[PDB]
Design a protein around this ligand. Sequence first.
Ligand SMILES: Nc1ncnc2c1ncn2[C@@H]1O[C@H](CO)[C@@H](O)[C@H]1O
Ligand SMILES: Nc1ncnc2c1ncn2[C@@H]1O[C@H](CO)[C@@H](O)[C@H]1O
Ligand SMILES: c1ccc2c(c1)[nH]c1cnccc12
Ligand SMILES: c1ccc2c(c1)[nH]c1cnccc12
Ligand SMILES: [K+]
Ligand SMILES: [K+]
Lengths: 330, 330
Amino acid sequence: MTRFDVLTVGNAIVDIISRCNDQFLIDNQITKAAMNLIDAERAELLYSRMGPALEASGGSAGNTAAGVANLGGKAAYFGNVAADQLGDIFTHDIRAQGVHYQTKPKGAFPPTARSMIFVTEDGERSMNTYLGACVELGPEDVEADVVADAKVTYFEGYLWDPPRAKEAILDCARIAHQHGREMSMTLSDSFCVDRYRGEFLDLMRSGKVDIVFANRQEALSLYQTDDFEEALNRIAADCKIAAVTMSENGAVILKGRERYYVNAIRIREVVDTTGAGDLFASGFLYGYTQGRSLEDCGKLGCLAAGIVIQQIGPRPMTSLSEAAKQAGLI
Amino acid sequence: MTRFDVLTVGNAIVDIISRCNDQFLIDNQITKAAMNLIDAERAELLYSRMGPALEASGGSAGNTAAGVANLGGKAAYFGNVAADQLGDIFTHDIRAQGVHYQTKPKGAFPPTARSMIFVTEDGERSMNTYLGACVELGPEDVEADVVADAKVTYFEGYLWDPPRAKEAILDCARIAHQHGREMSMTLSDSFCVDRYRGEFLDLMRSGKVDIVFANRQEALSLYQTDDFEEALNRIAADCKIAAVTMSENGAVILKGRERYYVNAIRIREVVDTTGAGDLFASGFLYGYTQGRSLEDCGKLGCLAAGIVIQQIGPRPMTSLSEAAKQAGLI
Ligand SMILES: Nc1ncnc2c1ncn2[C@@H]1O[C@H](CO)[C@@H](O)[C@H]1O
Ligand SMILES: Nc1ncnc2c1ncn2[C@@H]1O[C@H](CO)[C@@H](O)[C@H]1O
Ligand SMILES: c1ccc2c(c1)[nH]c1cnccc12
Ligand SMILES: c1ccc2c(c1)[nH]c1cnccc12
Ligand SMILES: [K+]
Ligand SMILES: [K+]
């Protein structure tokens, strides 16, 4: 018996969420459905144009860790906040979900990362992220005991933007594999993949990553192709297990020559897609660390994702474990 | 043509919102449905026991001003935040709604007020408020030109808790009545009324307040009676106009011997009662300053209240003006 099912590592972010029209994205040159990196000046600018907002703890890997705990798994998280009110919110929210979170802030400046997330009428989300204190995440923040005692260590593609986070990730990979654990990543965003395409391929091909998460857009970007079938064939060749999501078209889990397709749950209405991919990973990884079939992992992932997209905010406010029990996924 | 329809004055607060069971309230000695003042030590203690939360700009009068702007009226707000991240959120949200808000922070400590609001399964909300920078609001924060140029100046009973806010209110009353405007207050909370019963009665009887807002519990507390008919008779004798809310039983507007009963709107589900009274005031006062009948003012209030209780958070995220037009209140 270990200490953790899943350790996640990512950019520790508080979300600032508002509804907007499609014209707002165009007028502000915000790339729809993407993670748009912004500096401090642009952050003030966009905020000044944003309507009344709601704040909620975010960060892709943070959301995933929270989702694992919610389901009943044992989660830990590495991510750097500042010693400020946003950092205190982030710290409270993830710990309150029962995620082990011990990353120490290094002062108040730069301040805690925030992402201004604009949700259009179709429920799509477009994020505008000032990384702030995230740029300080480094090897010093790896709790080696936690990596050793975690069945899976999962991290964001997004970690390739700050300068030193990749160094922590390579340390994690070493420790995890020396202790017989597995490493997992998400490709995070199609433009993120475009920035670090060769780096991500090498992580998979070198065996530093055992399990990869992608959506259709990320898979297409990875191989710079318009052929989804090609992308699936190539991603299966590059990593031991790939979990590929296709929004309303469900998901497909790849392992060698095996493909396992899973239906998407039918939705009342899509309120806010923020966190869908993150909570797919929560469901998948919770299932995987419980020894479940790859199809059942995919099912648990789709259930979590379906729930999160029917609420405002990236972390389900309801019990995922109760939802899983009702679904016979238990 | 004057600059503002409604000026409101209150405690400038950011809400920290979480769902709990009724046992949580009992275990923590939290008075259900009430505003519970807390010190910094208790605030840290309650937060440590609170689940994952979402944050949203609050403050009773702040919500009311936001509501008036949403409906399409011209609003201003007086309230003191700190120069910190929470005060920046508060400043942004209220201004983003189109409310004039120019109260200057005086420093970073005490920090911006926050209220931990626990929503039980029945949708009732129980608030736990550390006043922080609110204690600094005083005469120096009265923008005399704004008072002079506002049709109605409305304020919270809650302002009697901090030490100097009442002095600002007395100055407001003087400037308002010198310029032929009207003053309004809400009784805020039944325990607030119990703390300041004689002071509140004197505000009404002296004519410093022209229009009073109360719910049933507040009206009963004011006269220390179990007889609601007595409370209505007495409140009508003590102020020019009283607007008394009765939750699912609608509202009654009183003027001398005139009484106007208004029905509650039909609702899907009570998600979170936070802000109901605030937004009743928004609807009523928007109507009042547009020269609408007292019955139509009550209708506009019940519409606004009904909308806010079907969402999480105290400020409607949808267009109240659109809703009013759809309801045939225009
Ligand atoms: N650069 C980034 N790194 C990690 N997560 C991010 C980034 N930008 C936005 N997010 C998070 O993505 C989550 C949705 O997947 C949001 O909660 C938001 O907090
Ligand atoms: N002491 C207080 N004074 C003014 N407003 C308050 C107080 N405590 C809580 N509130 C606000 O009451 C609003 C709901 O009516 C909430 O948004 C909360 O912010
Ligand atoms: C960002 C997002 C997607 C893409 C990209 C950059 N470059 C590509 C080249 N080919 C296909 C997709 C992409
Ligand atoms: C708080 C809330 C309600 C009340 C109170 C204090 N004192 C009362 C005396 N009589 C009736 C109600 C009350
Ligand atoms: K969501
Ligand atoms: K509400």
